[PDB]
């Protein structure tokens, strides 16, 4: 390019975001920051789930990993604001909010657990070996496992542990969420092509943002893509388990928003 342009790009090889992509990045980043219930201190801040909760799984589940009702109830108590914030996030992306209402609902149902799991995982704390839920509750593996998630707990913890070394910033988290959200791997969508074009736009912007960041761990982009796949697997395991739960447990134990968002892979 021009002489100044060349000087500035001297140590970039790879494609940077275009100005249009920078706008997309800026909007998504701010959408995430404003909805992630995370200030400046998120660690020193809030609270561990008491040690004596989550050690007593006694409700049966088909896979043999029983549920501790007390821990389950502690989790459902905080889950409604977590779900709500995912919706708040999505509503702030123009490519999402311009979709038919019915498509918006399908996309939210499709990715809600994926995004919640990512948000918990990025708050993994190696020192205490905890995840943080709804931005306030720190939990141990056993507590989250016994409190209803079973093997899904192990999967989120393993993701959180592995993500520590990626040093993701708010933008990278936000773009991961946008890619999870704008997926056509759901049934009943009207605007399939538009949603796919949006996902393609986010993916390319995200790849370019990763180039911009110059991470010092190698193969960063495909490594991050593999984590997207892990999150989708977490979402699928959760969907299967949630069906089970509803078979096992009375409806009064499930907040209405919790029931609504995790509808339909059988119930
Ligand atoms: C309750 C909780 C909230 C959390 O929020 C993440 C975010 O808002 O930052 C993210 C995680 C993964 C869950 C744990 C959870 C997620 C799904 C689910 O069905 C259950 C039942 C056992 C009540 C628990």
Numbering used by the authors: 144 to 410
Sentences from the paper on this structure:
The human (h) TR exists in two isoforms, hTRα (NR1A1), and hTRβ (NR1A2). hTRα is expressed at higher levels in heart and plays a major role in regulation of heart rate, whereas TRβ is the predominant isoform that is expressed in the liver and pituitary and is involved with hepatic cholesterol metabolism and regulation of metabolic rate. Thyroid receptor (TR) activation occurs when an agonist ligand such as TH or similar compounds binds to a hydrophobic pocket in the core of its ligand-binding domain (LBD). This causes conformational changes which allow DNA bound receptors to interact with coactivators, mediating transcription.
